[PDB]
């Protein structure tokens, strides 16, 4: 279907609408770049290889590259594999971009660059060299950076990538740069904020240096600065998870009262982890229009009882106090100043780790009137004793974020100790009002904590010691609910009638609940979804389930049911039908994971006894070595069948006679080592067919007729074991021009021989002695 | 060192003096007996294979063959596997055994066969047909067993194996058996005992039958009998985990209350699931040596709180009463019947699944004085409540068993409730007393709740709910303690004082305990360790621990730490110095298991960093892609390490050149592809060498100079991809004659080329055509 076969071991896609032609060639073990990219190409990617060097000859016809992205070809030792490390850093020749008259973005991040790369073309607006070894900044060395509007110079010195001296800018050095708009120079060892910058500044990035004062002409000039950064200046370091050294007598980051009065601009000031201990009002009378304000990892704690400084803040739509706890201090209560009440915008309020014992209503009265809060994250805060009951004057809010908490009768995991949250790599609040109690210490529940608690959509439980005996009466409060995270709990099932107060119940996670499925002789009533008529998923993975009181589990409304990590292999031993049907009467079942169920076998029965309307079913890693392929007959509305990571052999002979109706077949990581001579024949509702990491040493086209094949939508078929003998002639050819998609045909679609082949790509082979 | 190689896929064993040339071809996919088994073998394993017939040309010249083991060639398809599944039951040639004058034992068990073989030798003394399809047993068919002292017919007719039809039996069938000692027919579906038995028995295997009635003189002659087993007919089946039909109203089994009346030598009676209402004490009137008794799984609720048996129970060593709970009770207290006092030699007394809700001291008082009491199991009672002091009076006993409660402020897993706890295929307690409080619902504790158990040697607090800083304030009275399981809590070493009050603690589990360490920001003092200054071992798996707030752990006692399945990579991020030494000063550590740490490389530091008396360090299952091996010369006692499942690629080009000390090497499951010129050369301490399951092709001498292999106690080589080309001439004369020990010379050394060769193991191979 095509006439010439595309060698290139790139992606190559068109815009033709943006006129943007794009080769991307990431992560491809090139050790040069490859000949023949298209002579259109706008946008060139070589990320994640090892090319050595960039000459006059690299980019060669490439007149039209609108963007370089050349990145991590040769990364600083501590942060690149130490398996493949760099042995030279990247070479650039004279010459090597000066041709380029239209490249507008130049990536050459992690090279270990010693010097910026010189005679770029003077249409450049980007430029970025993180992650290289550039800590001595001259403005005679930015002459060539005339037009530049995005300069990245960051993490060139830090301790991830030492250059053991302090960072150096020359005076005015980015001044004369006229369309400079953001600068980062963070991670770097900076030591002063260095002046003086261009107008022009939206966006200034110096957080993670060694700043120790701000004079107060540093930001006289940037009028039109949005976004400013000064973060870790002088960071607060305690259980720092990475190196961190104070600035000396604990100093906070000393910025003067009104060195932020040319700010007028100022949508953002980033001011976490600098050990301040106050908060001058006086900083803030000339930004009234800044929306997110950082004061996250200082001494805060009695300054958040204080707080005089946001009476100035009325647009202030973020506001981050969290860790300002003073050290070895366990408050007793939350102080928070009748100041916070004259926040009128504020949607987003996050004091995590103030670290105190009880929180009472009136503690929160200065929220009572924030109109657009939407969000309270009081996590991390070691809370014993809370009234959830408080929170029916929050009605207004959409999460309210208690977790990781003490109680008892969405942010990266590793968020605010992070060192750069923002470095660049080479569910259910969607319900409604939420509730975020995960990772607490509630042991027991009654329907009294939730008093005054209606409006709940969603509610989250998971991770705590809830133990108890579910009958019915413990969630009768929440008449709304629709989402409950229940896992990592010890739910005990004695009771058919657990969640049934939960009368809008749509989503029920109890996976993870597996303390009482795993002792013999417990009762656990499976059947307990017969109450819930509104339920949609129902998710109890992990739960070790070996044993069953119910036989069936019944329900008219369950569309999806996740019964992963479980022991079905047991519940269907092979002589005992008791379970062969516990989902036949989830009628409305479309897609059942039993995955991760030891089932080394299916027993007899178990197709017949799925629920009717059947779309995705998962086996995947069963040790699945057998399967009557037949049975499939039984799944009639069956779809998606996804048999990945198990030790299946064979594939079936016809699989046009085990279904009518199968779209999407997952074959990967098994031990197929052939195809059926006839295995795909007249399957025309096949669309995806995953055989990938298989042991397939030859497919000839009985297997595969080509009317099938062609309306594949994808066909994997990356590490297998190909014999690219004449006998594969028609399997090479039809790799070769086909227009299915095939992914890794440069990395993974392989000859492992005869011996002449070995590690040859399928694609690149040339057969032509089998035609002589 | 060999002249004649061994070819035989079979482990070829012998015991000079008992004369026993031992074969032993278990599970070597066989299809027919292997030629040239020794003429002199006495004992022939089979056991599963897939020899489809036996015929006198079997055994032909084996003539001194005192057992064959040939069970399990063609097991019945519902115990077997389906992805091998046996296609035609095993067919026995006439005369096959008869000239076996010396066969002793002959086990045929799981083969699918119709009849007892007949021709069968006089000399035979146990004969085995458990899982065949033997339903009718004629005395005709037994005439040949004369001299049969051991008779297993079990499993012939059950719901794993079902015949469809009651088990017949001849009208004293067993009588003529003069010699029989042991009759098993349990799994039989048997509706009456057999009968008249023989006189000689002294083991009777009834159980798991449809026997409802036992006629008050079926065992009229057993005076010889030792061991009867009643258990499983008219089964109690709730919870059932198998296929269970109850006696019609669920009735007793009735047995007469003269029925044992002739068995005065019974030491073991097994009545557990019987449906048994009471005990008449008439029973154990002439039945004075009774030293086991099994009334488990029946209607002894009530009973259990009268029990006038027990006075006829003075030799009675162990009596279980478990799982006797009338359905939907739960009692508020434990009535066990003052008549306890008179069981003097009880050593273990069982009451699991009695269902309660509080135990108090006055209910265990007919206890008090049982001299012998060494076990008190009160297990899965869901128990709410019991003041622990109350086990000051039980000092004498071994362990105290509370496991699976609900308190609050070895036996298998399946074991009451598996169908045949005794289906044939085909731990604190050596410190003193243990109180075995884990799986409960303590979510916390304080110094009180152990008052007066000062004798505790062992504390299983192994999955409760403690989330508690422990301040070392909690275990004060355990004075005497050397082993705490503290495993699945959720530990929170917020104090580096947490333990210490267990001055004698030899042994500590602190195992996932990962909650507290998978929330940023939160305290954790590893160096808690240097407060026990006799501890031993201390095991802290799967905490996923990747923070710490101290940066050395130190102990001067401590030998042993379990670090296995935590993030170390995170803990010793490169360019991170600071936990470098993390381990430096437990300064008399032997074996450290840091595997599962995620520790795709080493950073440099932590060989050097590794405490100086390091005899045994586990690196496995890290994702180990690069290993600087030179730096193990750091680890100067370095005498066992462990690479296994890891991604190496290489071994270092000269072993003794990198250690000392080093005895055992484990590099199994790498993806190690050839071995270095002089790999092994003076490695004089080498003992131990795994380099199985890596992708090795070929192995020259200079790598395996033989004044090393000849100090190899094993030499591990199996599963690699061995290339048996004329190249290899060396290594397969080596293999074939050498007297190292290579496990599995015969099942997985094996060539997967050139062609004619592949699949064929190295052993056997002919490479003459090397030499013409
Ligand atoms: C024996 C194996 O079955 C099993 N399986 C479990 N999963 C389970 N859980 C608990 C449990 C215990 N205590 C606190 C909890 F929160 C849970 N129990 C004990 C129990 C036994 C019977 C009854 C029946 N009710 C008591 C009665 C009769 C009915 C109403 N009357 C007051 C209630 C509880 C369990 N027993
Ligand atoms: C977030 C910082 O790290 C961290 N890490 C943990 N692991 C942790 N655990 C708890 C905890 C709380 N309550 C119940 C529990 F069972 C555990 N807290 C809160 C806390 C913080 C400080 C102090 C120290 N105070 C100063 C002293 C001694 C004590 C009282 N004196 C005034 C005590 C408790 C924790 N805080
Ligand atoms: C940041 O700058 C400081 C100071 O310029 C660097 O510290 C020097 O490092 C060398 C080599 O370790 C020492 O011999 C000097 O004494 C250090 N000077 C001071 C003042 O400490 C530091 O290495 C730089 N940090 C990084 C990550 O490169
Ligand atoms: C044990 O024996 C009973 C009868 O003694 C067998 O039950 C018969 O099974 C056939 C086929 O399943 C039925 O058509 C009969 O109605 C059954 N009879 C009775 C009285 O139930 C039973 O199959 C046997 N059990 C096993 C495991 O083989
Ligand atoms: C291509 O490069 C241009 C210029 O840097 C950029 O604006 C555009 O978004 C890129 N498009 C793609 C698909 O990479
Ligand atoms: C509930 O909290 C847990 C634990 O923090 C979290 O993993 C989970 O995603 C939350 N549930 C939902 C539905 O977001
Ligand atoms: C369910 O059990 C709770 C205790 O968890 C109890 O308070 C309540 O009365 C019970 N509900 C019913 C309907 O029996
Ligand atoms: C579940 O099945 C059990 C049978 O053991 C029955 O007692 C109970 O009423 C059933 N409950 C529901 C909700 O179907
Ligand atoms: C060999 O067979 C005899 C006869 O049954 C048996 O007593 C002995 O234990 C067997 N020895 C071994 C090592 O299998
Ligand atoms: C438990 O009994 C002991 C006597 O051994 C007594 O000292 C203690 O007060 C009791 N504790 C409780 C909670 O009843
Ligand atoms: C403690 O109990 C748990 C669970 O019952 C068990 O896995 C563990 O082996 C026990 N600990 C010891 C030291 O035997
Ligand atoms: C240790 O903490 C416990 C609470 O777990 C407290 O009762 C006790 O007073 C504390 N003791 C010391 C010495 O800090
Ligand atoms: C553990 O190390 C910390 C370091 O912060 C120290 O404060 C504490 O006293 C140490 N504890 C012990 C028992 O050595
Ligand atoms: C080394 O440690 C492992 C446990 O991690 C143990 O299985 C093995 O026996 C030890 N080897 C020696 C020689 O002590
Ligand atoms: C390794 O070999 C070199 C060269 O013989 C030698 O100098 C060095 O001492 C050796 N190291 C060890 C630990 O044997």
Same mark, same amino acid.
């Given at each position: 279907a095509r006439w010439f076969p595309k060698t290139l071991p790139c992606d190559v896609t068109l815009d033709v609408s943006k006129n943007h032609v794009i080769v991307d060639c990431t992560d491809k073990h090139l050790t040069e770049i490859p000949g023949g990219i298209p002579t259109n190409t706008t946008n060139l990617t070589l990320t994640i290889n090892h090319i050595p060097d960039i000459s006059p000859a690299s980019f060669h016809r490439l007149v039209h590259l609108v963007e370089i992205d050349f990145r991590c070809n040769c990364v600083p030792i501590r942060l690149g594999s130490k398996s493949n490390m760099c042995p030279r850093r990247l070479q650039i020749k004279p010459r090597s971009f000066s041709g380029l008259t239209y490249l507008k973005s130049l990536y050459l991040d992690g090279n270990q660059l010693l010097e910026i790369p010189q005679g770029l073309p003077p249409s450049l607006q980007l430029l970025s060299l993180e992650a290289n070894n550039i800590f001595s900044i001259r403005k005679e060395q930015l002459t060539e950076l005339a037009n530049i509007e995005i300069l990245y110079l960051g993490q060139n010195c830090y301790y991830r990538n030492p250059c053991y001296v302090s960072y150096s800018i020359e005076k005015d050095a980015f001044l004369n740069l006229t369309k400079l708009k953001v600068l980062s120079l963070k991670?770097?060892?900076?030591?002063?904020?260095?002046?003086? *910058?261009?107008?022009t500044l939206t966006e200034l990035y110096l957080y993670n240096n060694m700043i120790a004062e701000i004079?107060?002409?540093?930001?006289?000039?940037?009028?039109?600065?949005?976004?400013?950064?000064?973060?870790?200046?002088?960071?607060?370091? !305690?259980?720092?998870?990475?190196?961190?050294?104070?600035?000396?007598?604990?100093?906070?980051?000393?910025?003067? #009262?009104? +060195?932020?009065?040319?700010?007028? &601009?100022?949508?953002?000031?980033?001011?976490?982890?600098? /050990?301040?201990?106050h908060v001058p009002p006086?900083?803030?009378?000339?930004?009234?229009?800044?929306?997110?304000?950082?004061?996250?990892?200082?001494?805060?704690?009695? &300054?958040? =009882?204080? +707080?005089?400084?946001?009476?100035?803040?009325?647009? *202030?739509?973020?506001?981050?106090?969290?860790?300002?706890?003073?050290?070895?201090?366990?408050?007793?209560?939350?102080?928070?100043?009748?100041?916070f /009440?004259?926040?009128?915008?504020?949607?987003?309020?996050?004091?995590? =780790?103030?670290?105190?014992?009880?929180?009472?209503?009136?503690?929160?009265?200065?929220?009572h009137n924030l109109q657009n809060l939407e969000v309270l994250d009081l996590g991390t805060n070691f809370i014993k004793i809370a009234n959830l009951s408080m929170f029916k004057?929050?009605?207004?809010?959409?999460?309210?974020?208690?977790? #990781?908490?003490?109680?008892?009768?969405?942010?990266?995991?590793?968020?605010?100790?992070?060192? $750069?949250?923002?470095?660049?790599?080479?569910?259910? !609040?969607?319900? =409604?009002?939420?509730? $975020?109690? /995960?990772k607490n210490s509630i042991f027991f529940i009654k329907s009294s904590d939730f008093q005054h608690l209606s409006f709940?959509?969603?509610?989250?439980? /998971?991770?705590?010691?809830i133990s108890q005996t579910l009958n019915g009466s413990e969630f009768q409060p929440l008449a709304e609910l629709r989402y409950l995270d229940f896992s990592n709990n010890r739910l005990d099932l004695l009771h058919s009638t657990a969640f049934e107060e939960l009368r809008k119940l749509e989503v029920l996670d109890i996976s993870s609940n597996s303390h009482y499925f795993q002792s013999e002789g417990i009762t656990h009533m499976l059947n307990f979804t017969k109450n819930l008529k509104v339920l949609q998923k129902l998710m109890m993975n992990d739960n070790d389930i070996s044993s069953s009181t119910s036989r069936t589990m019944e329900s008219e409304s369950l569309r999806t049911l996740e019964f992963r990590g479980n022991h079905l292999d047991v519940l269907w031993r092979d002589g005992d039908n008791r379970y062969l049907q516990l989902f036949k009467n989830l009628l409305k079942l479309e897609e059942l994971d039993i995955s991760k169920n030891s089932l080394s076998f299916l027993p007899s029965g178990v197709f017949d006894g799925m629920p009717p309307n059947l779309k995705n079913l998962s086996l995947a890693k069963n040790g699945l070595k057998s399967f009557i392929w037949e049975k499939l007959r039984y799944l009639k509305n069956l779809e998606t069948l996804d048999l990945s990571h198990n030790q299946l052999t064979t594939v079936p002979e016809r699989l046009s006679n085990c279904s009518r109706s199968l779209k999407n077949l997952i074959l990967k990581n098994n031990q197929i080592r052939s195809l059926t001579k006839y295995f795909l024949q007249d399957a025309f509702q096949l669309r995806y067919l995953d055989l990938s990491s298989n042991k397939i040493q030859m497919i000839q086209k009985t297997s595969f007729p080509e009317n099938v094949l062609n309306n594949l939508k994808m066909l994997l078929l990356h590490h297998n074991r190909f014999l690219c003998t004449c006998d594969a002639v028609w399997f090479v050819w039809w790799v070769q021009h086909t227009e299915v998609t095939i992914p890794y045909l440069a990395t993974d679609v392989t000859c492992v021989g005869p011996g002449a082949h070995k590690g040859q790509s399928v694609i690149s082979l040339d057969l032509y002695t089998c035609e002589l």
């Open positions: 991670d770097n060892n900076v030591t002063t904020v260095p002046t003086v *910058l261009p107008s004079q107060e002409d540093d930001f006289n000039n940037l009028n039109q600065l949005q976004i400013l950064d000064l973060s870790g200046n002088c960071p607060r370091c !305690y259980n720092a998870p990475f190196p961190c050294t104070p600035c000396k007598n604990n100093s906070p980051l000393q910025i003067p #009262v009104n +060195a932020f009065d040319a700010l007028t &601009e100022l949508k953002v000031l980033r001011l976490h982890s600098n /050990s301040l201990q006086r900083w803030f009378k000339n930004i009234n229009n800044l929306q997110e304000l950082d004061l996250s990892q200082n001494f805060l704690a009695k &300054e958040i =009882g204080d +707080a005089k400084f946001l009476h100035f803040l009325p647009n *202030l739509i973020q506001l981050d106090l969290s860790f300002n706890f003073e050290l070895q201090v366990y408050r007793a209560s939350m102080n928070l100043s009748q100041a /009440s004259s926040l009128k915008s504020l949607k987003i309020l996050r004091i995590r =780790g103030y670290v105190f014992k009880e929180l009472k209503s009136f503690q929160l009265s200065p929220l004057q929050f009605k207004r809010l959409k999460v309210i974020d208690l977790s #990781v908490n003490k109680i008892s009768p969405v942010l990266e995991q590793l968020y605010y100790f992070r060192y $750069d949250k923002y470095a660049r790599s080479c569910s259910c !609040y969607k319900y =409604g009002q939420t509730l $975020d109690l /995960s709940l959509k969603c509610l989250n439980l /998971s991770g705590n010691l």
